[PDB]
Structure formats: structure tokens, C-alpha cells
């Protein structure tokens, strides 16, 4: 089986460096050019750069957005290609995919699409510090009630880094629950919400507690959500 | 300013056919550089789908086909199946930028259930958050289908963008979609207006909820 495994991703402060190895297996690594592509959260693919095979000198070519800061090298004795990222910026936050350039022959030239992709490694560039969330109740009322149901929830505000996990009533309440993806605020901190739609007849007889876990800060919070 | 562009979204019913355009320029497709297409299933890495304008990898079925003409290219998908829902990207080298350009991606929806209108709830700042000297309004949207939606905020009827963050629609455990939006204010800002609204637009219908600090 052909496999490409990127490693080395994580959190990094702006201005710092990170090197991402990609370990290749299952094919003749030295025959292929290799290429890096990235994808910022919720955004499109953006090509980063390529490196040619060693019989062509292992010369390189980069996108203008990274030229002067990112470089690629390869170690054919280990079947690894590296992306060296220097002077990182918040806009470099992305999943970084290592890819193999195909060798299939076309009409008088070889094609050069990216025929194998790794699963990617996530790089997050931020100067924020670890911060546990503040959990606020989103109380149900007549303004959240339509047709015998009421919405209630919890606002998980101002934490860093991702992720948080949320359950309701210690995991016993799952029907009508939706926990949203996080937003990244201009402060550099994340926030998300979790909402449950419940029968209005249950308010004031059924207790609703959201359970919030933020492993990076070792924070666990239970918050009872009471009607207005 | 992009050199390759794609529609943000396309949809079709099960069993039908869609086309996804890759609109390029004389510096890329028009110069004869080949087009490559990738399929990216939700939460997965991209996969090569078409190479060299029109060639399928051995395992890709002939429901997928690629073509070009002049400065544009097209991906056609027939016999649409739920499993085809994905983001599709075109790629071509561009001489003016001297690199491999990607189109912006097209999200394909396979319309597998009837249209469903969103439920909307707008929560004012909690008393607990106000005690912490902050005031976040939370607009939560759920149970809509398909996934295209617009969320807009107003303060005393005036459109607001500063302080707003919104999630892209997320699939629910019952296969419909949900979305969230926030307006983050100081307590003084919150109390300075008489009403705020979040307006959710879905398939030509709008739902608006309002909150008032004096409630």
C-alpha cells in the first residue's frame, strides 16, 4: 500500500519555526517529485511547493506566499521529504498535506497531478496562551419557545487552544443536542455553543446540566441551565 | 483576485447530473496547461479524480468526466449518489503567478430530503456574563435543509459586522443542518441600543428574532 505520513504539526508562536517530515512507504520514493499543499480552516486548497527527484538535482519551486520563509528538502536514504517553515505567521495556520506527484505518461510529456495525499498534519500559529473556557447558561424562555419546544444551551466562551467537548446530563441527554464548531475571535480565543431543544413541559421539572471539558487547561465545568 | 474560479456550491437530486465549472484565463487553461480535479470528502484528504483534463484513475468510475475548451474546464458527475457529497477542486499551472493555482472549490449537495425551514433562537447576554463585564448575543439556527443560509445582525436596525463571528453550517445528528452566530459587545454597548436582531435567510425565506436590553 502506498502511504504518506506527515508529522511534526502543532501549536507554534508567530515568528518561530517548525519542520514537518513526511515519511513515504510502498513505492519508489526516489523516482517521484513530492509536493506540499495546505488548507486553512474552512478554506480551499493552496499549493505550497514542490521538490524534484534527485536525478534532476532535487531542485525546488515554491508559491509566492511562502517564498523566502518555507523550503523543502528530501532524504532519499530514509524516504522522507521535509517542509521547513520559518518565520511563521497566523495566516499559515492550516492542515499541511504531503503529496506524491504522479509519473503517468501523457502525449509527449508526463502528467504531474498529485496522485497520493497524506492525511495531513495541523499547524496552528498563535501567540495566545492556554486558557480554560468560561461557561455561561443560555436560558430558555418564551422567546426560545415555539410550538411546545424550547431551546436552551451553554456558551463556552474564550478558551485556547481547541478543542472542547460538551455533553448534557453526563451523557444521558443526546436527543435534540447539537454542539457547534468553534469560532476564532479577533482576540485569538475560541468560543462555541451547545444547544438542546426540549419539551417546554419539562422546564422546571427536568434538570439540564452541560458538562464541558477542556483538556489543554485541565478544566471541567458543569453548568446548570435554569429557565429565565 | 484569482486566476481560476469555481462556483461556491452546486446541488442535484439523486440519480441526476451536475456540472462544476473551472473558469480560467489565457495564463492557465487558455495557454494549454492541463487541468486536474480533486474530490475532498468531508473530513478527509483530497483524492485525485481526473488528471490531464479528462483521464480517470483506474478506480474512478465513468460517472465522473472532465473536459476543457478555451479558457475553461468542466467536471460532470452523473448518477448522483449521496456518497458524492464533497468539495471538488480544479487545478492548473498559471504562467502569470508561476505556480499551480487551485479554484476555490465547489461544495456538492445531493438533495436527499425535502426542504426544511430553520428554527432560530436569539439569546441575550446571560446575567453571569454581564457580571464578568462582557455581553455576547448568541443566534442559534437548526433543522434546515439544504445547507445554504445567511445570518445577519442589526443593532437598532443598523447592519452590524464588527464583533460578529459565524460558523459554516454543520450537519446535525438527524441529517439536517445547523449554524451559529455571535455578536460580542461590551456591557455598555449592549445597553446603548434598544433592540438587536438576527435575521436568518434560507431558500428565499427569512426568520428574524429580536432581543431588547430593557426586557
Amino acid at each position: 500500500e502506498v502511504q504518506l505520513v506527515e508529522s511534526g504539526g502543532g501549536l507554534v508562536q508567530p515568528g518561530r519555526s517548525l519542520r514537518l517530515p513526511c515519511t513515504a512507504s510502498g513505492f519508489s520514493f526516489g523516482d517521484h517529485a513530492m509536493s506540499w499543499v495546505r488548507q486553512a480552516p474552512g478554506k480551499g486548497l493552496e499549493w505550497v511547493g514542490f521538490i524534484r527527484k534527485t536525478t534532476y538535482g532535487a531542485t525546488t519551486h515554491y508559491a509566492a506566499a511562502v517564498r523566502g520563509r518555507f523550503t523543502i528538502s528530501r532524504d532519499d536514504s530514509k524516504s522522507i521529504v521535509y517542509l521547513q517553515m520559518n518565520s511563521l505567521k497566523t495566516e499559515d495556520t492550516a492542515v499541511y498535506f504531503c503529496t506524491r506527484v504522479q509519473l503517468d505518461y501523457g502525449p509527449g510529456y508526463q502528467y504531474y497531478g498529485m496522485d497520493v495525499w497524506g492525511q495531513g498534519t495541523t499547524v496552528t500559529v498563535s501567540s495566545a496562551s492556554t486558557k480554560g473556557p468560561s461557561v455561561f447558561p443560555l436560558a430558555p424562555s418564551s422567546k426560545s419557545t415555539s410550538g411546545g419546544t424550547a431551546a436552551l444551551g451553554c456558551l463556552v466562551k474564550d478558551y485556547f487552544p481547541e478543542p472542547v467537548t460538551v455533553s448534557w446530563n453526563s451523557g444521558a441527554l443526546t436527543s435534540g443536542v447539537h454542539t457547534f464548531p468553534a469560532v476564532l475571535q479577533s482576540s485569538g480565543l475560541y468560543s462555541l455553543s451547545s444547544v438542546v431543544t426540549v419539551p417546554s413541559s419539562s422546564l422546571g421539572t427536568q434538570t439540564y446540566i452541560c458538562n464541558v471539558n477542556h483538556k489543554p487547561s485541565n478544566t471541567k465545568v458543569d453548568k446548570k441551565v435554569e429557565p429565565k | 483576485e484569482s486566476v481560476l474560479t469555481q462556483p461556491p456550491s452546486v446541488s442535484g437530486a439523486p440519480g441526476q447530473r451536475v456540472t462544476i465549472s473551472c473558469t480560467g484565463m489565457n495564463s492557465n487553461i487558455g495557454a494549454g496547461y492541463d487541468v486536474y480535479w480533486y474530490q475532498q470528502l468531508p473530513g478527509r484528504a483530497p483524492k485525485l479524480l481526473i488528471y490531464g483534463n479528462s483521464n480517470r484513475p483506474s478506480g474512478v468510475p465513468d460517472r465522473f468526466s472532465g473536459s476543457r475548451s478555451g479558457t475553461s474546464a468542466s467536471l460532470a458527475i452523473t448518477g448522483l449518489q449521496a456518497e458524492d457529497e464533497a468539495d471538488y477542486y480544479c487545478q492548473s499551472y498559471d504562467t502569470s503567478l508561476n505556480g499551480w493555482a487551485f479554484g476555490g472549490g465547489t461544495k456538492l449537495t445531493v438533495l436527499g430530503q425535502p426542504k426544511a425551514a430553520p428554527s432560530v433562537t436569539l439569546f441575550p447576554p446571560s446575567s453571569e456574563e454581564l457580571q464578568a463585564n462582557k455581553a455576547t448575543l448568541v443566534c442559534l439556527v437548526s433543522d434546515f435543509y439544504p445547507g445554504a443560509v445567511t445570518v445577519a445582525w442589526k443593532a437598532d436596525g443598523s447592519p452590524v459586522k464588527v464583533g460578529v463571528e459565524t460558523t459554516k453550517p454543520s450537519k446535525q445528528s438527524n441529517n439536517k443542518y445547523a449554524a451559529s452566530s455571535y455578536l460580542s459587545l461590551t456591557p455598555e454597548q449592549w445597553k446603548s441600543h434598544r433592540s438587536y436582531s438576527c435575521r436568518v435567510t434560507h431558500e428565499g425565506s427569512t426568520v428574524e428574532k429580536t432581543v431588547a436590553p430593557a426586557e
Partner: peptide
């Protein structure tokens, strides 16, 4: 052929 351009095609 444009696709033999080494800036476009690392196999060329």
C-alpha cells in the same frame, strides 16, 4: 507542449 515547462511540470 506547454506541459513540458519545468516550472509547471517537475517531471520534465
Amino acid at each position: 507542449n506547454p506541459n513540458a515547462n519545468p516550472n509547471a511540470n517537475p517531471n520534465a
